[PDB]
Design a protein around this nucleic acid. Structure first.
Ligand SMILES: [Mg+2]
Ligand SMILES: [Mg+2]
Ligand SMILES: [Mg+2]
Ligand SMILES: [Mg+2]
Ligand SMILES: [Mg+2]
Ligand SMILES: [Mg+2]
Ligand SMILES: [Mg+2]
Ligand SMILES: [Mg+2]
Ligand SMILES: [Mg+2]
Ligand SMILES: [Mg+2]
Ligand SMILES: [Mg+2]
Ligand SMILES: [Mg+2]
Ligand SMILES: [Mg+2]
Ligand SMILES: [Mg+2]
Ligand SMILES: [Mg+2]
Ligand SMILES: [Mg+2]
Ligand SMILES: [Mg+2]
Ligand SMILES: [Mg+2]
Ligand SMILES: [Mg+2]
Lengths: 55, 152, 117
RNA sequence: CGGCCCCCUGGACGAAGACUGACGCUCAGGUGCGAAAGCGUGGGGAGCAAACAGGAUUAGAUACCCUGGUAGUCCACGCCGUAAACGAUGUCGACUUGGAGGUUGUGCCGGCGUGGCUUCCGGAGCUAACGCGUUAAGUCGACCGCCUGGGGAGUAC
RNA sequence: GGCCCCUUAGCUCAGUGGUUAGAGCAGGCGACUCAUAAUCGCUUGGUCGCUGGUUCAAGUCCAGCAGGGGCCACCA
């Protein structure tokens, strides 16, 4: 997320644009997902459980 | 309570000054329901302070009261099951009540011969930043300042 | 001594601590400060207030270099991800870029086992 | 069974036509393949981590948490032959109302059809019940494997 | 035998001849929790060994001993 501040704009707008770029980029989700190790069976079960609950 | 039903109860200003604040202070100083013995002490202390300072009779009390009123206190709040010390604001009525109570308790612990003289000394010191109520207010302020990171 | 007027501020955000360091554009550090050394230990060390204080106290030690402009690049998911740059704004520094530099394996190694708390 | 490219190689499906003429189904003994951990000989070793050492928590803590860390995890060849190896549902064939999707072929003019595989709901019927329901646990045929109260015991010789 | 390190709260470490005796370390009282454990706030405190020196000005500079300390040296 390279956020280049442009001419004649305050700090708040650039800050909000950077925050939205990071939120849409999904960096925090990846960093959380890589904190520990997940056995293949555990993830295969959790994905199906989430899919069943959603539908 | 669980219901939010309670309200405010009317109070009569004191006769010779028409001030609700003096009424509340007298109530705080009253014991055993013997009110008539309370305003006597209050009046004696007020007149002794008035003659000692020479500024006024009612403005000295107001200045001493203002010198002690705090603006922040510490309570407990939780987010994930662990208790904290969080600083919170104080409403004006609570400020006045705390100031009066601190002044009374500070006055009650001395070695003079009369209670009115103790009151005179304590109001004087509060007006000139030497009473123990000043120490109470400062300690509360600094404990609130120490636990500043937890302020949501 | 020396005059630069153009620097870059690197932020290391972590669940336990935050580190702020200002360096020249060729990666030659001029100063740094941490929330841990700023008088905060234990639980308070992991709050955005600590990151704000650390950022301001670090900027307080780069005034002699006469820095006029800064850009910020930040890594880590910690809670100091936000208040640090606002505290830098309150120091009057010019802000030109805000960038994310958090590392990401494209597979990589194997993470440690989950804690059974 | 998962980054990208090349070489060798097994199966499945659809479309019209031709050819052989029952050459079929199932299968006791027999043969082959078969997760991970483990074993033998020779390599390699970033990260992780049985055993092991220290720090805590605790009445105790040979643990759960933290700091370290060796076999092992990786490669070539050779053994081992076991899993909640599960759809807890043997293989082959025929017949029996519907609705909503997914993936991949083909014919005629976005429309009208026609095959293969696959996900969810549900009718008759079945079932002790839960439930299954054209991918049956529904109605029949051919062959194989297995069961006969709980422990002792999938143990002893 | 010769050079050289210093002597300070209940304890350990700091302290420039002027207008400092400095912090940490145990305890006491409060703060939070229904209440401990962990956290936070305020504090009970000092003979600069004895003595002397020059010096307006000395814990401060010099030491005499003593105490606790190294090396140099060693053919009654
Ligand atoms: Mg537990
Ligand atoms: Mg057989
Ligand atoms: Mg293996
Ligand atoms: Mg092995
Ligand atoms: Mg091996
Ligand atoms: Mg080996
Ligand atoms: Mg490890
Ligand atoms: Mg471990
Ligand atoms: Mg092993
Ligand atoms: Mg078996
Ligand atoms: Mg399996
Ligand atoms: Mg079985
Ligand atoms: Mg079978
Ligand atoms: Mg159904
Ligand atoms: Mg039976
Ligand atoms: Mg039996
Ligand atoms: Mg039996
Ligand atoms: Mg057996
Ligand atoms: Mg056996």
């Amino acid at each position: 997320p390279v956020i280049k501040v442009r001419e004649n704009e305050p700090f708040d707008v650039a800050l909000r644009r950077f925050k939205r770029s990071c939120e849409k980029a999904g960096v925090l989700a990846e960093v959380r997902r890589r904190e520990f190790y997940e056995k293949p069976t555990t993830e295969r079960k959790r994905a199906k459980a989430s899919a069943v609950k959603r539908h | 309570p669980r219901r939010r039903v309670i309200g405010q109860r009317k109070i009569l200003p004191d006769p010779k000054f028409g001030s609700e604040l003096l009424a509340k202070f007298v109530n705080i100083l009253m014991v055993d329901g013997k009110k008539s013995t309370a305003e006597s002490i209050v009046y004696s202390a007020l007149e002794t302070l008035a003659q000692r300072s020479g500024k006024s009779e009612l403005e000295a009390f107001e200045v001493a009261l203002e010198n002690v009123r705090p603006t922040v206190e510490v309570k407990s709040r939780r987010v994930g099951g662990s208790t904290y010390q969080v600083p919170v604001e104080v409403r004006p009525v609570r400020r006045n009540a705390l100031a009066m109570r601190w002044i009374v308790e500070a006055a009650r612990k001395r070695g003079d011969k009369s209670m009115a003289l103790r009151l005179a000394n304590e109001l004087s010191d509060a007006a000139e930043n030497k009473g123990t109520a000043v120490k109470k207010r400062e300690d509360v302020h600094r404990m609130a300042e120490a636990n500043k990171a937890f302020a949501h | 001594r020396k005059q630069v007027s153009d620097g870059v501020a690197h932020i290391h955000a972590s669940f336990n601590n935050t580190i702020v360091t200002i360096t020249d554009r060729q990666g030659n550090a001029l100063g740094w400060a941490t929330a841990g050394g700023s008088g905060f230990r234990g639980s308070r060390k992991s709050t955005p207030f600590a990151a704000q204080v650390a950022a301001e106290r670090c900027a307080d030690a780069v005034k002699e270099y006469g820095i006029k402009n800064l850009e910020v690049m930040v890594k880590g998911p910690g809670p100091g991800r936000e208040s640090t740059i606002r505290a830098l704004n309150a120091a009057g520094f010019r802000i030109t870029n805000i960038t994310d530099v958090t590392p990401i394996p494209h597979x990589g190694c194997r993470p440690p086992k989950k804690r059974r708390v």
